[PDB]
Structures are given as C-alpha cells and as structure tokens.
Amino acid sequence: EFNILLATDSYKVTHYKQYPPNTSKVYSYFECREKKYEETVFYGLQYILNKYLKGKVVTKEKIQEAKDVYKEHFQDDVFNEKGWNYILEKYDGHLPIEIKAVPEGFVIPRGNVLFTVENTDPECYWLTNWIETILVQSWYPITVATNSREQKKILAKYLLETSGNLDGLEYKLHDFGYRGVSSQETAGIGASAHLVNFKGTDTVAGLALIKKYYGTKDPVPGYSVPAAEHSTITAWGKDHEKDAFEHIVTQFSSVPVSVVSDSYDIYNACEKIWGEDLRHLIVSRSTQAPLIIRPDSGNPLDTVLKVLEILGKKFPVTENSKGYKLLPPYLRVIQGDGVDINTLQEIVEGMKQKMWSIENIAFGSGGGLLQKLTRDLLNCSFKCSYVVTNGLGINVFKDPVADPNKRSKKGRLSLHRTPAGNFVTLEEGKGDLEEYGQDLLHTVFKNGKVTKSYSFDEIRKNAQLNIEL
Amino acid sequence: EFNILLATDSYKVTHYKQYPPNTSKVYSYFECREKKKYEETVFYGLQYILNKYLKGKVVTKEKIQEAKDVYKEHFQDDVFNEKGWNYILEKYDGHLPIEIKAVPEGFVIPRGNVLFTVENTDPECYWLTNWIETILVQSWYPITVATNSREQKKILAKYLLETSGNLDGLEYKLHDFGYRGVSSQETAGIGASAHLVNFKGTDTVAGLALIKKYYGTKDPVPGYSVPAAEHSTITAWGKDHEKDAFEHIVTQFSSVPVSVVSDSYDIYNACEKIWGEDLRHLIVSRSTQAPLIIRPDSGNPLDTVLKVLEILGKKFPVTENSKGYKLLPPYLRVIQGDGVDINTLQEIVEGMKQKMWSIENIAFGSGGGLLQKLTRDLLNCSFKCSYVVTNGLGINVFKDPVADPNKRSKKGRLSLHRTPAGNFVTLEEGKGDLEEYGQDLLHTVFKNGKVTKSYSFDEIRKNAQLNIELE
Ligand SMILES: O=C(NCc1ccc(S(=O)(=O)c2cccc(C(F)(F)F)c2)cc1)c1cnc2n[nH]cc2c1
Ligand SMILES: O=C(NCc1ccc(S(=O)(=O)c2cccc(C(F)(F)F)c2)cc1)c1cnc2n[nH]cc2c1
Predict the structure, then answer these.
(1) How far apart, in whole angstroms, are the C-alpha atoms of residue B372 and residue B195?
(2) Is A296 annotated as a binding residue?
(3) Which residues 419-448 on chain B approach chain A with CB closer than 8 angstroms?
(4) Ligand of minimum distance to the alpha carbon of A200
(5) CA distances (Å), B126 to each of A210, A358, B17, B116, in order?
(6) Atom 3 of ligand 2 has which residue's CA nearest to it?
(7) Is the Cα dihedral A148, A151, A155, A156 positive or negative?
(8) Residues A110 and A220 in one domain
(9) One domain for residues A337 and A204
C-alpha cells in the first residue's frame, strides 16, 4: 500500500537537516517555465490531492517501514522519524500543508504561477519540499492535455477551412495509446487528460479515473466503436482477406466499423476488395454506420492521399460548399500510424492542398499522444520562493549564470488579471498592494482536506478553444 | 480494485465476433522488431505484470457486471462478450486459461527474436489471447529502460576502462534522478527497478519496494543513495549566504559522501572562490569514503563539466594516473545531473577523454532521459498473432504490408534457440519440433492462472551483465 514517506526522491530525506536553523516556513510554487506551446492547460492536480495527499496518510506502521527502508538505502540513520511522528500525533497523520491553485481546465500562458505550497505548522517547514516529487508529476497530465489541445487547434483550423464548420471536431483525434504508455496508472491519467479535449478513446482506464476523481453528468466521458485488428484479418489466411472483410462488416452492419486494410496490400484492399468485390456491402450502409478504412503503414501523408485517390475513383465523391471533395457518408478513413502533432499537421495541410475535406478523415494517436512527452516540453518546475527564518520573511530564488531561463520567481506569488484581461503573476508579495484586484488562485488543499474541486464537465468548459467559444 | 475486463483497448472488446468461425486457438508472440542502434535488448518486467495483474482469480461476477455497464455506455451498444467471461468464471474459478512462455528475465537477446509467446489453453477462450495484448505489451517499458540503461553502462565502461585501467565504481556511475520526471507513481517504480538491473544508485524510492515484492534480493535493498542538497536548501539561506549554506551542509554530513548543487547563482564562482578558497579547509580534510561531490546543474553539459574540472584542478592537488589521465583528490568528485541522456553522456565522456580527465572523476544523474524519454518505437516492441487453429487445422499467419517490410511479422509456432556459434535464432513454422537446434530457451512462466517460473533480482542482474564485466 502507498506510503507517502517512501514517495519522495531519496535526497529529500536529508533536507530537514540543511535549511537554516529556526526556519518556520517554506513556500514553493509550480510553473511551466517560459523559454510553440505558448499556453498550458492546467489539469491533474485534483487526482493527486485525492489519491495520495488527503486524509490520514501517516501511520505508525508507515513510519516504521520508511525508517527500516532508509536505514538500508542510506546505510545510515538519517530519516526524520521525529518529524513524521509529530504529524501523526498532532494531526492524526493529516498533512499540515496549504496548496493554492488555478482552476483545473484553465488555459494559462507560460511562466505563470499555477500552484503554490506551504506548511501551516512551523514544525513542518521540511514538509513543503518533501512533497515536491509527487506534485511535480502533475507535469504529465498538464502536458498531455496541452499537447492534445494544440492538436485540436490544428484540426479546427483545417476542418473549418475545408468544410465551413466544426462538426465532428471532438471525434477527430482518438486515443490509441493504452499499450504504448509506461504503466496502467499512466494510461488512466494520460487518457483522462486527452479527454479534456476530445471524446474518443480506446484507453479504457481513463473512464474510471474521471468517474472517481472528477465526474461527468454523462454516464461516460469517452467513446469507441467496433474495429478490426491485424489478428482478426490475418487469422483467416493470406488468401482470405476478402472473407474477413465481409464477415466483419456484416457482423457490424448497423454501427460504425473500422477495418485495418494494410495487412498485405492497402492499395489492393481499397481498389479491388472494398472498391469492387465488396462495394455492394459498403454503399448500402447508414450515414450513422460508415465503414472507416484504416491504413497502418507507409508514409502517413502519401498513404492517406493515395487511399483517398483510390476511393474517390471507386465511390461517388461530392464537392462540398467550400469546393473540397467529400467521400459519400457511408465511407471514411482513419490514419492511426505515425501520428503526432507534427505529422498531423503535415497530413491535414497535404489533404487541403489536394482538395480533400478534413471531414473525410480522423486520426488515432498512441505513443505520440500519451508517451512521447517529457517535463522539458513545457519546462514544468517546482521551486522555493519564500522562507521565514528567525521570524523574518526572505524572498529567495535561483539565478544560474549560464542559463537565465532557469531563473526562478521571488517571494510570495499571486495570479491576477491585467487591465487587458490577460494573466500576470505578481512576485514579492506585490499582490497585497491590491493594484491588480483579487488573486486568481484558490485554496484547493488545507490540512489534509481537499477544499475546492472541479467536475470534468467544468474542466472541459474551461479548456475550450477560442474558435469553439 | 483493478478489473482485467476494463484493462484492454476498447476495440478488442469486439474481436470475439471477428475471428474465423470454428477457431479454437490463437497463438501470439512479442518481439523487439528489427529495423532497417540498440542491437540487443534486456528482457525484464514480465514477472511484475504476471503477478500484479494476471495471476489468480481475476474474474468475478461483480467485475463482469461492471464491465458490461461501462461498455454499454462507451459503445452505445451491447457488444461485450459476457458469455465468454462467464465461462472463465464458472469453469476455472476466474483464472485465465492462458499459457505464456518467455526467455529468462535478464537475458540479453538480439533484435528480431521471440521474447515471449501467448496462447489459450481452452478452445472456448481463443479470444482471450489477444485481449491481454494491451497489458502484456506494456512490458516494452521496463525492457526499454533496462536496455537503454545497459547501453549507457557500456559507454561508461569503455571510457572508464580506457582512462583508469579498470571498472571500479562503474555500477554507481549513472544514478536515477527520474522520480519527478515520469508520468506516474507506478511508472516510477517500474522504471526505477529496470535501471537497477544495471546499476546500484537510485533516488527513485518506489523501485525498491517493487523489487522486494515481485523479484527479491539477498541484500536488504537493491539500490542506494547519499545525502545531497537541492536548490531550496541553498537558496533558503539568502543570496548573500551561499557560503554559509555550503559550510552548514558539508558539516552536517562530514563523515558520509555528500553532494552539493553549486550553480544557484554562479557555478564557476562557487567552485573557484567558495569551494576552492573560502571553504577549502573543510574539503581537503575529508575521508576518501566521504567525498564532497560538486553538482553543476545548468549550462552546456559538456562545456560546464570541463570548465568545472578545469577550475577544481587548479585549486586542488590533481594527480596523473597510470594511464596518463588527470585525477582529482579522493575527497573531491563531480556529478553532472542536468540534461543527461545516452547521447549527451557519450559527448561528455568523450570530451573528458580529449581533455585528459579520467572518467573516475565524474558520475552522472539522469531523470527524464533515463525513465521518461523513451517510447515503444525505440526497440519496435510488438505483439502479433502467428498461429491459429481453425476447423482443427493449424495455419501459419502473419502481416506483410506492401509499403513497409520492416513490419512483416513471423509465421507459425515459434521457438528460441542457441545457434552453433552460440548466438540466438528464432525458428518459425514449428520448425523447433525438428530438434535440429537444441532446446527451446522459452520457459513456461504462466499457465492457467498460476505463475510457474520466477526469477530473483539477483539472477536477473547476473543475466544482464556486460561482456566487459564477464571478462
Ligand atoms: O480502431 C481502433 N479502435 C476503434 C476505433 C477508434 C476510433 C474510431 S474513429 O473513426 O475515430 C470514430 C468513428 C465514429 C465514432 C467514434 C467514437 F465516437 F466512438 F469515438 C470514433 C474508430 C474505431 C484502434 C486501432 N488500432 C489501435 N492501436 N492501438 C489502439 C487501437 C485502436
Ligand atoms: O543528489 C541527488 N541525489 C543524491 C545523490 C545521488 C547520487 C550521488 S552519486 O555521486 O552518484 C553517489 C556517490 C556515492 C555513493 C552513491 C550511492 F552508492 F549511494 F549510490 C552515489 C550523490 C548524491 C539528486 C540531485 N538532483 C536531483 N533531481 N532529481 C532527483 C535528484 C537527486
């Protein structure tokens, strides 16, 4: 079972001994440091607060366990047993910490304070940065949500341009990343972050995360439809690809169905199998139940364009009010190979150049959506800015000579609206001067309790694109 | 509680309706597909997955109903195979009728070889083999962490041996700083455990408990750390009192090794004036078993390491070792823990060698580069069906996409063997049955809900040793 005394970087076990004597306060903050990705979606802290930080997180057993582990890990006794016991005895093991944060779903420019952390008991000065490691993991849902939203912006631009509206936008980028992430827990967190922006997911783990920690009015936040994989095609034998196709589309005759078509020869499959042999089974389908053809190999742009050209000669294509080509409503394409933010952009621009509407296509993204991301992308960072020692408050910061980009903010921080309606972070307690109105951070955690929270429905609202608004 | 019925890709819920009728067996395999460097991979991590997620009673009435309810809304349709899951519950008390055979954990195997196979043991459960693709394929992560970590050990070993004449301290030269930089607590434990296959230094505490619970070691713990500052414990003293912070910290930890980040304001000043003059007397008095380890944390990693060494070499008594390389006094060492991945690690040690500094002088910390900056595409980790039985006839199956030969999959029943020259070969089409190639290196590790063969972390470390270490 999870032990918060074992959920920090090893060296922080030794930090209580290193602060100035008589330090009563350590105040720290998190930002996506400024140096693409000019704004970030703040999402995922609520999960962390609830799963890991709230309530009785310290017990006698947990203290003894950490002591026993650290004795061996350090080959020495450096663990702060006394400090953790104080929390257990004084607060029934509830963390005497206060955290303030911007609302989940908020879209905030880089280099602003997103959350702050401080101890509420002078004895627990060391506690603020003990929990740095767990809190900093919020980088992941923030970065997934942010990158997913940037992709939605691209899709919106091109869908709007080639079709004249945004119908179907929230189903244009589907999460295929379950197998390509590093763990079950990561799958749930990452999938939920993608769902801030879209409604299509195969990463089932995200649904229960959202239900437990955020909630939606709707029964579920994300959806899928039947689809083949290579095994359900290839199992029929190399000479029976047509039979597999026919069986699958007949099994799923009245719901949407996606069929991967590149097991042997994508171009043959589109031109001869779907386009001729089984055409009669496709042109009969409901607009509510298209066949969605899936290529899965080759150059992503070149393959998409060739697949569309093939289908456009076998099926009745129309020209929409914008002058772009549209497959008939019972036939669509999904490209779910090699898709990341860069290749997504190359594909939609390439389709636009060849006069194909973005209405024709959806994208699936796995590793690119959920795994190919690091803390460096948005420079997510947690730093101490204020301490009280001998009763005196001091504004503190790092400012490395060789890299101004790593300079941290000083003193007590607050978030405000500027006269033009943008965000500004005020340093050095200047928020107290009340020249910039009220602090936009809310207390979300205090003394073991979650004090403010957001539904997944409100997070989605906060995260909307300007174009959608 | 974890629900295996909710731990697959959505579309796999619909696959039981798509296989050929009269199919009794689906047999699938996992490989790190050969591309067109990472020419060999460390197989590690399956044992964790088997124990945490696959073994024992994993199906219950409540879990089946839960899945039914979720999928009804997720698909806006009733597609879920309730009958198939009920069958497993009734006939096998909720244990998976699956057999998995795998190469021993720790084994180092060239790309394009079978690492494990999966098949159903009951004809009714043909659909189950690929249901669990999603959870099994996540083994890509500990494989890739272990492999990339080992490739870094090879670079360190080559340069340590060249500049010092031996491998002393190699197992402590790449420390895991990745706890905060990975995507979740679970990922942290798994990734940290995989790094420990190759090294002994970690700050990612989560790895220790995973190893104890799922693998085990003779020693109390698999990994170690030592006291160290962070920017907060320096900056809290105030900009004008960096020296006071340094003095306080090395005095607190005067008898153990201690690392002190030195770039809060001016790394070069800190080394030349603070460590090299003001506080020199507190450094030169230290034990060889308790050095000060100076940590820069910004600037160009190579340029900064070299300049730091340049500065320290002029303030402290440096010797020339028997290989002609410069060596800091035993009480003074350096760790570079910013911007390190396999590429920059290589650039740093080669740069050090060019400037005649022994690799003895330095250690590396890696966080995101070590544990997060990896994907399934690095080693092309992939799970594919190679054999099915339909109407009682076995057929060898595969994909072979016209526009990408690299994605062609293997055919039929597979086995892994030693070649006459002592290398590895995967035999396809059941050809291992001909017995021309000695015994199958795959062992049954899971069968019908039970883990049937396990490895200790000690055995895994042994299997994953570098050739240079063996020699
Ligand atoms: O095809 C897969 N999953 C099913 C699937 C997902 C997404 C689509 S879609 O065309 O975007 C689509 C169409 C209509 C409704 C929805 C809706 F509204 F439901 F979202 C989604 C169609 C089918 C699939 C394929 N390959 C994969 N690799 N790894 C995971 C994978 C998942
Ligand atoms: O300094 C940090 N951790 C403590 C630490 C780790 C590793 C070393 S080391 O020089 O490799 C070393 C020296 C002697 C023994 C060991 C031994 F045998 F114990 F492994 C390790 C010295 C100190 C640290 C620094 N920055 C970080 N960012 N994110 C996580 C971080 C952790």
Answers:
(1) 12
(2) yes
(3) none
(4) 1
(5) 32, 39, 11, 18
(6) A11
(7) positive
(8) no
(9) yes
